[PDB]
Design a protein around this ligand. Sequence first.
Ligand SMILES: CCCCCCCCCCCCCCCCCC(=O)OC[C@H](COP(=O)(O)OC[C@H](N)C(=O)O)OC(=O)CCCCCCCCCCCCCCCCC
Ligand SMILES: OC[C@H]1OC[C@@H](O)[C@@H](O)[C@@H]1O
Ligand SMILES: [Mg+2]
Lengths: 324, 1064
Amino acid sequence: RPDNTAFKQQRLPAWQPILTAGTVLPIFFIIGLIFIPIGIGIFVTSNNIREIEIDYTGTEPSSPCNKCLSPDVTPCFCTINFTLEKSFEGNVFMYYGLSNFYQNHRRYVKSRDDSQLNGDSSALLNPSKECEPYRRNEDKPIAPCGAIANSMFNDTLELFLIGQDSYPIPIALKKKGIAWWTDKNVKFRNPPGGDNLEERFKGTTKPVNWLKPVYMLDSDPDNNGFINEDFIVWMRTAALPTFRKLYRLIERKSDLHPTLPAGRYWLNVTYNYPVHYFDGRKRMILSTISWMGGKNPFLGIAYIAVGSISFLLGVVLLVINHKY
Amino acid sequence: PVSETEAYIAQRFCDNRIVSSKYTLWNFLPKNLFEQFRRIANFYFLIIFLVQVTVDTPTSPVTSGLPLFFVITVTAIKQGYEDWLRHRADNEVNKSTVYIIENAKRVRKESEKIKVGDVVEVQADETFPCDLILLSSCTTDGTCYVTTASLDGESNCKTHYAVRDTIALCTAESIDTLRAAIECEQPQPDLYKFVGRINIYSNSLEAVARSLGPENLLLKGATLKNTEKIYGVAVYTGMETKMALNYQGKSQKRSAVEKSINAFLIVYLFILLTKAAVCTTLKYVWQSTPYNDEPWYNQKTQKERETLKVLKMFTDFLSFMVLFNFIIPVSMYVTVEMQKFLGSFFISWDKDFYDEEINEGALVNTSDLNEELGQVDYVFTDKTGTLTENSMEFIECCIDGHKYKGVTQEVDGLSQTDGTLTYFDKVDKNREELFLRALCLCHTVEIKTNDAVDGATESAELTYISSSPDEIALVKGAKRYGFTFLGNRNGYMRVENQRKEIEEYELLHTLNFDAVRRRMSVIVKTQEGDILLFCKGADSAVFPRVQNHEIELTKVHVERNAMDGYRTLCVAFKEIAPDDYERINRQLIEAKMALQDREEKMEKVFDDIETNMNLIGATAVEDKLQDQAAETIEALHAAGLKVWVLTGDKMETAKSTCYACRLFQTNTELLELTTKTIEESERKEDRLHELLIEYRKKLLHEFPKSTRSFKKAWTEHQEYGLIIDGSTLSLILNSSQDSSSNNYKSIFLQICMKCTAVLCCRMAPLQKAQIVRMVKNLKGSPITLSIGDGANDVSMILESHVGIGIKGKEGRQAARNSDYSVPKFKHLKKLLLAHGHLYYVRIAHLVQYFFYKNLCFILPQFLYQFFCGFSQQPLYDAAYLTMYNICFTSLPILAYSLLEQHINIDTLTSDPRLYMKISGNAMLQLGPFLYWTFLAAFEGTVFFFGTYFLFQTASLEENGKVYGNWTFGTIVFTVLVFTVTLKLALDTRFWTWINHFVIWGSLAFYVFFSFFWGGIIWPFLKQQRMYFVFAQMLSSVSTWLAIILLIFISLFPEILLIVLKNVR
Ligand SMILES: CCCCCCCCCCCCCCCCCC(=O)OC[C@H](COP(=O)(O)OC[C@H](N)C(=O)O)OC(=O)CCCCCCCCCCCCCCCCC
Ligand SMILES: OC[C@H]1OC[C@@H](O)[C@@H](O)[C@@H]1O
Ligand SMILES: [Mg+2]
């Protein structure tokens, strides 16, 4: 009587909603009527999108790049002719895809030292312990302290078009924003200060395998030191045995003509990344995109199924309890 | 053997204290810790912590110790509170105000310090603080009156006397009284006998029994009445009851579900073991030969630590288990204790059952058996103290079935207000005269001579003191009518018919109440005439006389009276001749004054003297209950519970109130195992099967069968069970190792089981614990609940799976010893029928859920190793793994446990048939276990596979970018939390306004925290793996449409279930 309250006598306001067959029956019907169309939609949408890939690894003397596979003269070259049966007007995207490259690995991701990357003062001085193998080389601090940076994807590619004139016709590309705005402008920046680029690193050597330093990669300084977009995208662990990385990109011109037309194209590469040592492939994939993305009919058929399934379920659920 | 020093008082003896606590002030940790490690989770994480001290391991010792100590201490506090509560409740009664004056201090002392050999003053209406020796009573004849309704549970009063008188007034003023001393022996626990000498050639003997026994020795809780102050010595005997209760000294922490917790952890530990074995082995074999150093991305210092052939194997085995050890959950104990404790107050601060008297409605003793309360199967109850009190009253006598009773009512309000001048005698002043006269006579009452102010109570004190209250209430009924029965000590029961008329009579001879005959009579001489013969007798002991004029009228009413649970007492008389009376007189004194085997001669003669009589009706008397019998017993019978009564009150009144509670149906062919005790010592051996093997199967196959789920309708139930006495029980229990033809205890339980109910009369507390353990072993293991009033059945409170006590019914001391206290037998229905069963649904859903979350959380973490180079690279963020998981998981589920009734308390209280039978223990049997794990698989596999399927493009963003490793893992983490939370939300039924807020609030906590972390706190801290990654993920509308499908497919089977579980 004196200390009684609702919380102490289980008599609080109970919303108490209770379900049954007749209450969820529509839910199944409605979700089917909504899912089936949405799924078939994303299916055709992500379907129409046209993509194409080519493996320039060799592994077949039949392919011209095979004779350029094993250790050959340092600057190896090879061409891989390919045809484009269809022309895609949508502003294209260029990715370099690889296989059997275990990006996701404790030792491979733990070597990334966000300090030197972000551009910290005390960082440049000493690299952390997590980057146990590539801390220094011959007792000199490395700026890109990490096995990921050491294992950069440097083999560059060049794509040309062929028209009625059998000789080549290169295609223009833009290096801006190959990485997201955040992981390039705020996530990482240059050391404490500097108007020029070399002064920022005084006694700082470079990664072992990397021959030329990072301060000598791109002409414009907004894409050279620890902010080079190519290297930054590679510094993103995809987490899959096989994965794709965006190299460059060919956006459409402010005009209405079609970006890439139908015809034979020329592909020449610079083979400077060995992979046959572990039976891994190397390739490049070009494609268009949409609000969904490149070819991936998974979500489409998934919605088709989930919808139709729930719908048929309601069908039975209804035609059975209706017998009352 | 006690010296009992003469000039001195005492030394070298065990004083009296209160021992009802579990742990001790000094060695509590060595007790609580071992009792706490019976929970495997703690054991597994402690062995893991211990192992993490051999060589350098990636996991730090602090993150290995913190999971243990944060859990160990919580239970330690919620175990301490309990023991300290019992300690305070014990100290209060330990330091009780006690009157005592022997050595020097004239003032009164405390019961905490009372050495042996000390005179103790026990005022009127005082509870004996200990057991004493009495040979000095203040009042004349050194006679007092004491009742033992808590020690042995006797309804009949205790008679005793002493030799000296008020020697205490001289003990304080002088030392002359301290001349004598007492010698004792090795104290025996039962307390039946204690012998010695007291400084003179005199054998001071004593012995207890289940009936009225000891006079000299006193006992604890022996309520004192009809006296001023008494003085006794030798306090050490108080330890006798302590030694009688100590049987339950240390058997505390258990549960019906916590056993299943460890059994659950078994297969769960095997799950871990299996995953660790597969991961480690399938790594060594699959990539160990050529991929160890080939990838060239990394090169371990000193070639994989000089490639130790097997040390690497073990270092990685641990690296896998410690990462997989979330399967085995330890944070489920802190939350389970929070439920166990914060759910305790639900019964404490409750008005649903609060005695209007300052007496407390309930008390909470332990926070360890709440969940198993509403999960009982067998119940052991008591008669006096719980079902009734040590008294009895009479109502509606039947003189030829003519006397009835009425009350005030709407239509019949005129005749009840004022008595008419004609209705005062229709069937009363015709025979009621002799009826009430015989009532006032033939009774060994011997009432008090002095009295207090006549008018303090309804009429006067009117205290008639006899040996048993069987007839003490009959005189009170005579008082209700016109008769009074005043004095009678030196006169023949002077009484008053209706008005203030003395009605004196002379008592010539009085007959005894023997057990072979079972009748009580008296021979008196009236003042206005000749001699008469009054008598009452038993049922079939007095009906022997022909009584042609009036048989059916009284016989059927006696039948219905005994059936309803009354103690039918017939009444008759006869006219004796003046000369034949002398013939009987002489032949009776010839046997009385004969000193050669009078027990046989006297019995034969005074048994044949009564050869006929005149039946004058009957009188029914009932031993009133404490609560309505049908709701308490009918509800348990319908709920399934097996009800048994093991008590310490006389068999006659035992059978009486048991038959009154309707547990003994009208047509119950009862069985007894007490009348064949003195005769045929080895017949019981070949009698058990002849009465149970032969009869049960006979009536079971004569008529159709009787199922286990539903019963109590067919003629099979006709054959009720039995009632045993403490003798036959201890005779068929310890000495059943002689004959090997057929087992005896086995068949004893075989009959005690398949029946309506059973009664165990003449049973000691230890003797009742044997029955508790008797049922605690057959057919696996059922659950036992016991409840009693005083220290007689308190030795069952802990032996039974759960202890329920009533305070003040007889002895309160028994409640603080119990696990729960409820001074209301009526409200025990609410306790186990609602508050406990709710705890079961609550924590059962809680455990299935906790395992569900920690498995749906880690299964993707395991399958991910298939794509990770089995380098145990967590897909989940480092802190995100533990931090948000425990910051979310614990809140809504604890809300479910604390405040949630899958079905409300009143709708379940109104119907137990559809409440307890459906529950059982199936909440966490292999039925729902394998079903829930399927849900663990389906969601853990769909999370992973679905996300990995959508990742086949590298173009999710509306513009098209790469997707970091932690993005994928934080995608599955997301669908995971949304799925588990919404899952619980769909599984809940009680949507209180404070639970609805925490569920949605925790999901909010998720979005809010993950977003805050994603955007500001990156450069100020030590290091961060993902910066604006959570948002970068949420930027692709693709993932929206994908994750929603993932959670939907995850909960689709649950939705289906809900539909099924609620329809049909
Ligand atoms: C005040 C702020 C404090 C902030 C934290 C300060 C941190 C200081 C820590 C200093 C410790 C330095 C330890 C040395 C560097 C660690 C190296 C390491 O992690 O080894 C990893 C190795 C890797 O094996 P594998 O390649 O997958 O095996 C392949 C196999 N042969 C096969 O293919 O089949 O697998 C192994 O054999 C393990 C070797 C030992 C790993 C020790 C790692 C400890 C790192 C610290 C982790 C901290 C975690 C959080 C702790 C919280 C503490 C409160
Ligand atoms: O052939 C392996 C090469 O790798 C390291 C480079 O610095 C050279 O010193 C060495 O010869
Ligand atoms: Mg009792």
